[PDB]
Amino acid sequence: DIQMTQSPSSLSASVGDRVTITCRASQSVSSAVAWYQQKPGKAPKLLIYSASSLYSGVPSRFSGSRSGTDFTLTISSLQPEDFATYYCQQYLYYSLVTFGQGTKVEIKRTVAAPSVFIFPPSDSQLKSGTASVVCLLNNFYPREAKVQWKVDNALQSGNSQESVTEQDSKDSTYSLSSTLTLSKADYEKHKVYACEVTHQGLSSPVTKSFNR
């Protein structure tokens, strides 16, 4: 029934910094909220229970606090282990447990622009009657990029598909890939293909193109 809203939904923070993740209950829960850490792949872990009390075993840089109906976890020192997801979860009766959205904490990294490569359909996909083009955006920061598919200003929507990798193990950067799938007949229509990309580290959109 009650709604749990969690505001700083994506946080870029350097190593050893101080982060605060808030949470707001729709109704007035009493001091009955918890904070969980989930690392990608494993089951979640308890971190804070009963608003401010610490669970046994977890390190003591984490803290929690309550002001009325507004609850807050703070990490004073950002350890290089604590890069995961933190979920806010109330509890009141047994059948009313609801969870927050969950915020992701991220490594601060200096902004670099994408490198954009457009790959045409293969010389085998044409035989199967379905041709797909891809556009690869490589090695940038942060995630928020906008790809755009224009088959000579035919700004597609619904025929595209996009997927990022996770944060890179070394220099911590993303790589997006967009894909357009098309029929044999609808393929050779127009004659020019280009993907046009923007990003906050790009002064101008970059157009990478080839002619059919």
Binding site: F117, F119, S122, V134, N138
Partner: peptide
């Protein structure tokens, strides 16, 4: 799956980096 090449163009950066890929679908 079906596997397809993604060869770079001859005009797709003829000097510095070069991107070569495989698509499974």
């Amino acid at each position: 799956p079906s596997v397809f090449p993604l060869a770079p163009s001859s005009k797709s950066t003829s000097g510095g980096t070069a991107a070569l890929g495989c698509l499974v679908k």
